[PDB]
Structures are given as structure tokens and as C-alpha cells.
């Protein structure tokens, strides 16, 4: 028997396509090569490409795919379509796997909505722990979007129980708006700043800061971004600069290194792709957790029986029998992937027990400490604490 | 959406409601599928990535009331103030209230309510 798995992606088509489709193809091919997962089952898929927006078209493609029928669905990548997608999936008791953060459903938790990505509020506890460790009572935090404040809730309520004073700054959309705010950073002397922003902007934010020349050893810089390796690495200052951040992509265990360098050999064998400043060839978080979700599906299917195709309508409301069984089998699934060990709590399809490795630049790197949701900020290294003649 | 289909088959000039914005997304999906105006009763989260011209909300803007409250608080000139808000959903109306001490020096305190 073979397995049918469905993926719909809404991305711009005036430019070369998204890369996590490539990652999904590599992962499914990889499991098709290895027979240690299922020697009698080979995973198959039909891939459908659509221009972004027009959620009616997303629903139409969902109807097209439901005409055939699969065990799980990937995408859409925008909040508008996923509302109707989850509505119809819940009506059809079809579990839905998604690979990016969306606004959480606090009205009623969908039991068929399963996401693999570390939570904002967990990151908020993490930044609390790191800032308390560095024992700083004056910090200035700036974001560019309404969602960003949700990643910083506990800091916002931090003065309610601490002596901390907070300076909240906002970035208007477009990258030409930071030029003023940096000048007001000149006017009021500050050294302790947090940029809560997507990794898309951090590259040219660093470029602008180095152009103006504010990064020195006077300043302490920290980003909410979860990967510093992917970011542009021009930081080899002999002027002294303090750079700190998180890391989630495991780089030890030479099997993991082998997997990533297979992907790092595959990207380049295809012609060059023009970028914004991000280095092409080192793994991105979303596609990495896509790679992990593929193996979620694989291990889930390793318990299930042979697939049974069904024909239904997207305007009908008759549930399909193996849906509850598959969502249960997903529910008690636990694995070890690139982001670390993944498991799910018994009240939501939200991800838990995230790994957050603190990394700082000093080789112009070094283990400092880790955080987990099952404990606090675990100080692993006491540091060797060099002093020079 | 089945109710929307029923009314569409029957045939009217516009639709009123529903009260909750959860079903409003589906209702607007069908209405602009064939581009018919729909009238909303109260606040709905704006489409902040794509544009709709069919958005009739007769609810006062968050920006208007926020500027009104900033005007009042600056007019009565208290330099030491606290604000209490229901949740993170609460803070969206008074975003700029915590931003105001950039241009000024109000000592603002921030506290969060429980669901109880």
C-alpha cells in the first residue's frame, strides 16, 4: 500500500518559488529510500501550487483534494485561508498539520489543529531568565508589528513584580523608518536594547547599524531571532561587539551534520538564487520543522493500517472513519528531530518542551546555558573566564 | 455558511450580522466571492495583508478613542498614572498610551487582569 499526503502552498509566483517545498520533497524521497520505517509502505503525494490570497481558491483546491482524500494537509501559509480550512477539517474530523505560528484560537481549541513551532510565551519566559541573569534594570525593547508584543508579554508585565523599567519602541513598516529611531537612540544615551523582529529584517538592521557605527563594546545587543547562523555574518570586529541570541538547530551528532550537509550540497548543485543578505546554504527554521513534521507523519503512519481512499464533498458533513484514529496516533507521538525532542501536551496540538540554546559571538560559538519548559534556565557552563596579560 | 447559502438562494440585498467575528470571516468570504456588500455590527479584525472595499463597520475606531483618552490624560496633566486592562487583546486599543512617554515623561504602571 501507499500513503496519500496533501500539500497546498500560497506564495508569490513572480519570483522563484519557496524552498520548503524542496525540503518536503527531499524528506519524502529520503523516507522512500529507507526501508527501516515501513518496508511495505511507500509515501506518495500530489503537490498543488497556487498564487497567494483568494481564499475561495484555497477552498476550491481543498475540495479538489478532498475528492481524492489524504491523511493530513499542509498549508495554507496565511491566516485567512486556514480559518475555513480548519473549519472544514473539524467538520470532517480531519487532523491538520501546520508548520508556522498563527494567532491562537482562544474561543475554542481545535483538536485537529497541530503545530510544530516553539511558543512566543515560552520565549518570553526565556528572555526573562536571560535578562535576570545579566541583572539589568534598564532595557529598551523595540518591535515592528502588533504580534511582536505578544512575544514580549512577560517583560511588559515585568515591572508589576520587579524594579525593571521598560522603554517600548515601535518600528513603522518599511526599513527606511529605523533611521530616525536610531538618531533618538543617539539623543538619549542607551546601551541595552532588544530588537523583537523577524529574521527577514535583522540582516539589513545590522547592516544599517554597522553603517552608522553604533555597534561597539559599549553596547550589548540581543535579538529575539532563534537562529544566528542563517543571518549575514560580517561580524568579525576587532573593535569589540557583544552579540547574543538563541539557537535551536542542533549541529552536533555527525548524523545531523550529514543530513544538513546533504541539503547544503543540494542547494548549490542548482543555479544561484538571489537573496537579501541571508546566506544561502544553512538551514532555515520553518523548513527544518517542516522536515520534522514529515517524520511526524511517517511515524504516525507506521502504526496505522493500509490507507482507505474516500470520496466526499466539501459542502457535506459526513466524517471519515480513520480520522479520529489518525489524530489520536498523532496525539501520543514523540520524536527527536532537528529542533530537538518534540512531544505534545494532552490539551492542545500546540508544541511543547522547546530547546533554546544561548549563543554569543566571541570568535571574531561557545556554550552558555539552555532553557526548557520543564525547568528554568539551566546554566550548563560556568565559563572559563579568560584574563590576559 | 449554510445559512449564507440559504439566504443567497432566497435572495436579499444585504446581510446583517452575525454578532461574533468568527463566522463573519466566512460570511465575508461568500459575500465578496460574488462581490455583494455586507454590513457588520461591531469590531472585526482588519484585513492587514490584503485589501477589502466591502468593509462596513459602524463601530468607533480604536485610534479615535485612543487619541481621545490621550487628549484627556494630557489635558488634566497627571504625571503619575496606572492602567488596568483585561488581557493582551485589551492592550491593542491603548498601544500608543504606553508609547506616549517617548515624547513626554508620564510614569505609567501596567497591570494584567485574570479571567476571574
DSSP per-residue letters across A294-319: HHHHHHHHTTS---------TT----
- Closest to B85 measured CA to CA, from B103, B101, B105, B108: B108
All three cell numbers of A55, joined, read: 481564499
Between the CA atoms of A22, A24, A27 and A30, what dihedral angle is there, to the nearest 10 degrees?
Answer: -60
Count of C-beta atoms within a 10 Å radius of residue B6: 9
CA atoms within 13 A on the CB side of A63: 11
Residue of A nearest to B105 (CA): A167
Please, what sign has the CA dihedral across residues A21, A22, A27, A32? positive
Please give the method by which this entry was determined: cryo-EM
What 3-state DSSP class applies to B110? strand
Instruction: Please state whether beta strands B107-112 and A96-98 pair in parallel, antiparallel, or not at all (unpaired).
Output: unpaired
Cite the beta strand spans of chain A per DSSP E. 2-10, 42-50, 73-74, 96-98, 113-115, 138-143, 165-170, 192-196, 220-223, 242-247, 335-337, 340-342, 356-360, 366-371, 377-378
Burial of residue A110 (CB within 10 Å: 0-12, 13-18, 19+) is middle
- Closest to A168 measured CA to CA, from A150, A136, A188, A142: A142
- Closest to A138 measured CA to CA, from A158, A162, A167, A181: A167
Residue of B nearest to A151 (CA): B88
- Closest to B109 measured CA to CA, from A330, A162, A234: A162
The answer to whether the CB of A94 falls within 8 A of the CB of A112 is yes
φ/ψ region of A174 (left if φ > 0, alpha if ψ in -120 to 50, else beta) reads left
Work out the minimum CA distance from B42 to partner chain A, whole angstroms: 17
| Beta carbons within 8 Å of A42's beta carbon, 6+ residues apart | A2, A3, A32
- Closest to A32 measured CA to CA, from A75, A9, A3: A3
| Beta carbons within 8 Å of A205's beta carbon, 6+ residues apart | A175, A178, A195, A197
The answer to whether the CB of A367 falls within 8 A of the CB of A381 is yes
Instruction: Please state whether beta strands A356-360 and A366-371 pair in parallel, antiparallel, or not at all (unpaired).
Output: antiparallel
**Closest Cβ opposite residue A153 in set B49, B88, B98:** B88
Rounded CA separation B5/B3 (Å)? 5
Interchain contact A216–B (C-beta under 8 A): no
Which residue is listed with cell 513626554?
B104
Please report residues of B whose CB lies closer than 8 A to that of A56: 29, 33
Cited resolution, angstroms: 5.2
Q: What are the backbone angles phi and psi of residue A335, rounded to the nearest 5°?
A: -145, 175
Distance between terminal CA atoms of chain B?
34
Query: Is B29–A170 a contact, with Cβ atoms under 8 angstroms apart?
Result: no
What 3-state DSSP class applies to A177? coil
Query: Is A169–B102 a contact, with Cβ atoms under 8 angstroms apart?
Result: yes
Work out the minimum CA distance from A167 to partner chain B, whole angstroms: 8
The answer to whether the CB of A73 falls within 8 A of the CB of A97 is yes
Residue of A nearest to B50 (CA): A53
CB pairs A-B closer than 8 Å? 42
All three cell numbers of B7, joined, read: 439566504
Cite the beta strand spans of A213-355 per DSSP E. 220-223, 242-247, 335-337, 340-342
Q: What are the backbone angles phi and psi of residue A168, rounded to the nearest 5°?
A: -90, 125
Between the CA atoms of A257, A261, A264 and A266, what dihedral angle is there, to the nearest 10 degrees?
Answer: -140
Q: What is the DSSP letter of B100?
A: G
Query: Is B110–A84 a contact, with Cβ atoms under 8 angstroms apart?
Result: no
- Closest to A53 measured CA to CA, from A88, A11, A89: A11
Rounded CA separation A389/A338 (Å)? 42
Query: Is A150–B88 a contact, with Cβ atoms under 8 angstroms apart?
Result: yes
Element of type H or E holding B73: helix B62-76
Distances in whole angstroms, Cα of residue A380 to Cα of each of A215, A338, A358, A367, A375: 28, 21, 10, 8, 13
CA angle A243, A245, A251 (to 5 degrees): 115
What 3-state DSSP class applies to A42? strand
Residue of A nearest to B29 (CA): A56
Element of type H or E holding B81: strand B80-85
Rounded CA separation A102/A79 (Å)? 7
The answer to whether the CB of A201 falls within 8 A of the CB of A144 is yes
Cα-only R_g, chain A: 23
Distances in whole angstroms, Cα of residue A211 to Cα of each of A179, A222, A231, A245, A282: 11, 18, 17, 21, 25
The answer to whether the CB of A231 falls within 8 A of the CB of A199 is yes
Strand partners, A63: none
Interface with chain A: mutation pick from B51, B91, B92, B100, highest number of A CBs within 10 Å: B91
Rounded CA separation A271/B115 (Å)? 55
Rounded CA separation A76/A54 (Å)? 11
The answer to whether the CB of A76 falls within 8 A of the CB of A85 is yes
- Closest to A29 measured CA to CA, from A40, A9, A43: A43
Please report residues of A whose CB lies closer than 8 A to that of B92: 146
Rounded CA separation A207/A259 (Å)? 31
Rounded CA separation B19/A22 (Å)? 43
All three cell numbers of A363, joined, read: 570568535
DSSP string, A111-172: TTEEE-S--HHHHHHHHHHHHHHTT-SEEEEEESSGGGGGGGHHHHTGGGTSS-EEEEEE--
- Closest to A151 measured CA to CA, from A224, A46, A81: A224
Query: Is B110–A56 a contact, with Cβ atoms under 8 angstroms apart?
Result: no
Rounded CA separation A103/A54 (Å)? 20
Burial of residue B8 (CB within 10 Å: 0-12, 13-18, 19+) is middle
Q: Omega into A76 within 30° of 0, i.e. cis? A: yes
Tallying the residues shown for chain B, one arrives at 116
Distances in whole angstroms, Cα of residue A240 to Cα of each of A213, A216, A220, A296, B1: 12, 6, 11, 43, 61
Distances in whole angstroms, Cα of residue A15 to Cα of each of A18, A19, A57, A275: 9, 12, 20, 11
| Beta carbons within 8 Å of A305's beta carbon, 6+ residues apart | A322
List own/partner pairs for A256-259 with CB under 8 A and 24 or more apart.
Answer: A256/A338, A259/A338
Interchain contact A159–B (C-beta under 8 A): yes
Interface with chain A: mutation pick from B2, B8, B45, B50, highest number of A CBs within 10 Å: B50
Amino acid at each position: 500500500q501507499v500513503l496519500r499526503i496533501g500539500g497546498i502552498f500560497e506564495t508569490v509566483e513572480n519570483e522563484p518559488v519557496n524552498v520548503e517545498e524542496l525540503a518536503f520533497k527531499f524528506a519524502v524521497t529520503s523516507i522512500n529510500r529507507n526501508r527501516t520505517l515501513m518496508p511495505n509502505t511507500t509515501l506518495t503525494y500530489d503537490i498543488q501550487r497556487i498564487n497567494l490570497f483568494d481564499s475561495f481558491e484555497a477552498s476550491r483546491r481543498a475540495c479538489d483534494q478532498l475528492a481524492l482524500g489524504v491523511a493530513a494537509l499542509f498549508g495554507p501559509s496565511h491566516s485567512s485561508s486556514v480559518s475555513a480550512v480548519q473549519s472544514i477539517c473539524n467538520a470532517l474530523e480531519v487532523p491538520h498539520i501546520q508548520t508556522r505560528w498563527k494567532h491562537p484560537s482562544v474561543d475554542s481549541r481545535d483538536l485537529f489543529y497541530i503545530n510544530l513551532y516553539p511558543d512566543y510565551a515560552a520565549i518570553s519566559r526565556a528572555v526573562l531568565d536571560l535578562v535576570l541573569y545579566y541583572n539589568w534594570k534598564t532595557v529598551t525593547v523595540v518591535y515592528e508589528d502588533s504580534t511582536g508584543l505578544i512575544r514580549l508579554q512577560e517583560l511588559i508585565k515585568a515591572p508589576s513584580r520587579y524594579n525593571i523599567k521598560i522603554k517600548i519602541r515601535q518600528l513603522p513598516p518599511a526599513n527606511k523608518d529605523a533611521k530616525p529611531l536610531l538618531k533618538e537612540m543617539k539623543k538619549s544615551k542607551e546601551f541595552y536594547v532588544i530588537f523583537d523582529c523577524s529574521h527577514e529584517t535583522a540582516a539589513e538592521i545590522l547592516k544599517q547599524i554597522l553603517f552608522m557605527g553604533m555597534m561597539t563594546e559599549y553596547y550589548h545587543y540581543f535579538f529575539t531571532t532563534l537562529d544566528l547562523f542563517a543571518l549575514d555574518l560580517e561580524l568579525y570586529r576587532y573593535s569589540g561587539v557583544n552579540m547574543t541570541g538563541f539557537r535551536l538547530l542542533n549541529i552536533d551528532n555527525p548524523h545531523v551534520s550529514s543530513i544538513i550537509e546533504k541539503w547544503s550540497m543540494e542547494r548549490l548543485q542548482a543555479p544561484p538564487r538571489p537573496e537579501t543578505g541571508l546566506l544561502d546554504g544553512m538551514m532555515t527554521t520553518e523548513a527544518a520543522l517542516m522536515y520534522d513534521a514529515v517524520y511526524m507523519v511517517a511515524i504516525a503512519s507506521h502504526r496505522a493500517s493500509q490507507l482507505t481512499v474516500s470520496s466526499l464533498q466539501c459542502h457535506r458533513h459526513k466524517p471519515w472513519r480513520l480520522g479520529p484514529r489518525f489524530m489520536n496516533l498523532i496525539k501520543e507521538a514523540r520524536w527527536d528531530g532537528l529542533t530537538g525532542r518534540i512531544t505534545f501536551n494532552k490539551t492542545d496540538g500546540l508544541r511543547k518542551d522547546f530547546d533554546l540554546d544561548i549563543i554569543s559571538l566571541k570568535e571574531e560559538w561557545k556554550k552558555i546555558g539552555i532553557w526548557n519548559s520543564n525547568s528554568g534556565l539551566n546554566m550548563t557552563d560556568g565559563n572559563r573566564d579568560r584574563s590576559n596579560n
